[PDB]
Design an enzyme around this catalytic site. Structure first.
Site, PDB file in Angstrom:
ATOM      1  N   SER B  94       0.835  -1.200   0.000  1.00 46.10           N
ATOM      2  CA  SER B  94       0.000   0.000   0.000  1.00 46.10           C
ATOM      3  C   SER B  94       0.877   1.260   0.000  1.00 46.10           C
ATOM      4  CB  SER B  94      -0.932  -0.062   1.218  1.00 46.10           C
ATOM      5  OG  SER B  94      -2.110   0.735   1.053  1.00 46.10           O
ATOM      6  N   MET B  95       0.709   2.135   0.988  1.00 46.57           N
ATOM      7  CA  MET B  95       1.546   3.335   1.049  1.00 46.57           C
ATOM      8  C   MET B  95       3.015   2.963   1.252  1.00 46.57           C
ATOM      9  SD  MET B  95       1.332   5.318   4.680  1.00 46.57           S
ATOM     10  CE  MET B  95       2.952   6.048   4.436  1.00 46.57           C
ATOM     11  N   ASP B 222      -9.437  -4.462  -5.969  1.00 46.01           N
ATOM     12  CA  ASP B 222      -8.961  -3.500  -4.971  1.00 46.01           C
ATOM     13  C   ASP B 222      -9.796  -2.222  -4.944  1.00 46.01           C
ATOM     14  OD1 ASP B 222      -7.501  -1.666  -3.388  1.00 46.01           O
ATOM     15  OD2 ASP B 222      -5.625  -2.722  -3.815  1.00 46.01           O
TER      16      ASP B 222
END
Lengths: 271, 271, 271
Positions: B94-95, B222
């Site tokens: 993710s991040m 997603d």
């Protein structure tokens, strides 16, 4: 961040931003996270915000001894001194109103620019012979008895009257979950000792030692710390104190009245 | 374990097993625990696994400043240097795909053997003038406003689209509870600043600097980080990169597709 | 408080009160908080109470290695020496019965005044060639398989049989919440390694080395650690040991039978 108190107790704190310092003292049985929205609000607006986890609570060590207001006040003194804070605005919620008041009483106000008392137990919470209007001590005796059986469910049940959920106030499951998660971090011993401390400690002598601009804020729907015999009296006993009553607001008004509180703190700071 | 970053921030990390190192960078708003199953899987098969709590998250300190990708990348550099890691396989979710990429961009790949990007925000998440296909910034502005009101309920509500529970994925209440418990450890400030960071940071220059073997994995179900404008593009922009798409997989596929991921990571390491 | 074990593992502990020391060893997968009521009870009645978070659990570090009984016993030895404890009464619950027994076996009883084993895995939990009445190792193999899939829901589901809620015991949601919150703090690696350790470690040799007054307490309603092949046998194998059976008590009887346990510990200390 951490510092170590005189008796060896590690104390956790956060120190955010820069500018004039604002030091927050949390209520029972929470920790510094109860202030996170006020801290972000003020530190994004040019202030330095500091909040600690009281000994026995949150991320701090859990000493068996020293769970009393004189020690709490002296912990605050150590933090202020070790950071060399000047012109600090002290902000205390609930039982946290007592240790910021006791700090000034014990250490004077040389480093203090202002005082804010939010839903605070000041100047006196439980009954005394000359204060029959206070909460009878057997109320707190029963709290302690319940805490010594099952502190987890006690605090879970405490959510309702704390936030005024039983009076229609609206607080999410998430906030209630976070409240319990934080409270469970605390020491059982500290949790119980604090009840003894805030039930019986008399801060009336302290009120006469407060010689800085003071703002008292209290909800008049407060089910935990009754406005009439605390906040209302504190504002009268402190010379020059200002009183703001949040109509119908519960004890946990830093949640239910967050924006209003943020703006009132900012206004006080800019007075 | 802990190390101290340049600005004094204490960062928690786990360092398990021995052999070739694999360093994990977690997603928002979690911590090193999100990796526990991959770590046990690989470390029981002859790899050394390392995972940190990003500054402001989990067991790490919560600084007011430095909540940006250049600092996150340098935090990773300091951990790598601290342990003197060599031939490290960087794995970001993710991040966390952002700081492993920015680390390479800022420090080059001398110590790096391979890169894995899982549901990553790379190469670019939010809209730019030349990327109208990205996520509109008012989407993130709105996340931040909700987080600044009640981060606890926001993250609780996030569980559903994160794990794809609203779209047929099955995830236990235990996992949802653990997710929230972890999230609540984090700083409010870091939680919000990170949104700004992953919303607006452009990693496209970073892609051109990645000169090691690279595997991109992303679910095309997603709901959080759209496959079509992130993982799909990252795999094209990185020379030699391999792409695996988990059909209908959610953002939180390290949970829903744990065994598949474990096997894919092992396969990558043994390439 | 913390100390650092030989291999660098930082171990969290609490040390309350003063007087003759009582050192508590928690069960799986909890931490020192499981003892908070016994500690408050005894420390307010003239004893010094000490409890640690086993490596990999609670607030302790999470080493990949050393998750075995010899190391656990050596961790305890380090704490006893760190505090320089004398005439210590050792109290172990569940798997914690194992490391206090192994401590005495590896280091002798010069520093030990007494031993208490509560719902303990001693003297042997899993099957051996000469112990077919033990729990088949495939039972533990399946537990580990479930733990390696979803430890959070596994522990959540474990609440019922642990506290005997499925057999008419009454335990609050608060306690169940606290149980899970504590469990989630633990390492996945430690959580699984402990199953291996308590499943297969034979403490029968240890029983022969125990030359101090000993009290064994066990519930005969224990769905987790079978009374007949553990507590019942430890009491006979340890010379001079006293046995108390709590009728129909579950595994988690420090909760369900807290007052009874408190009084029995006090009576043992004043014997």
């Amino acid at each position: 961040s951490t510092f170590v108190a005189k008796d060896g107790t590690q104390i956790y704190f956060k120190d955010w931003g820069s500018g004039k310092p604002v030091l927050f003292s949390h209520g029972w049985p929470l920790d510094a996270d109860m202030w996170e929205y006020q801290m972000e609000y003020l530190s994004s607006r040019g202030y330095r915000t500091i909040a600690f986890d009281r000994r026995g609570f949150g991320r701090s060590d859990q000493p068996w001894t020293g769970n009393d207001y004189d020690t709490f006040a002296d912990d605050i003194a150590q933090l202020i001194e070790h950071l060399d804070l000047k012109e600090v605005t002290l902000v205390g919620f609930s039982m946290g109103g007592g240790d910021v008041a006791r700090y000034i009483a014990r250490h004077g106000s040389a480093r203090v620019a202002g005082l804010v008392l939010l839903g605070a137990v000041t100047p006196i919470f439980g009954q005394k012979p000359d204060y029959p209007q206070g909460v009878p001590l057997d109320v707190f005796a029963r709290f302690k008895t319940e805490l010594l059986k099952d502190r987890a469910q006690f605090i879970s049940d405490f959510n309702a009257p704390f936030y005024g959920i039983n009076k229609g106030q609206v607080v999410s499951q998430g906030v209630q979950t976070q409240t319990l998660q934080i409270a469970l971090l605390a020491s059982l011993k500290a949790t119980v000792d604090c009840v003894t401390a805030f039930a019986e400690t008399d801060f009336r002598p302290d009120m006469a030692k407060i010689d800085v601009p003071t703002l008292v804020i209290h909800g008049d729907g407060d089910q935990i710390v009754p406005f009439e015999t605390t906040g209302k009296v504190a504002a009268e006993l402190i010379k020059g104190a200002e009183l703001k009553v949040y109509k119908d607001a519960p004890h946990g008004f830093a949640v239910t009245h967050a924006q209003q509180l943020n703006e009132d703190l900012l206004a006080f700071l800019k007075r």
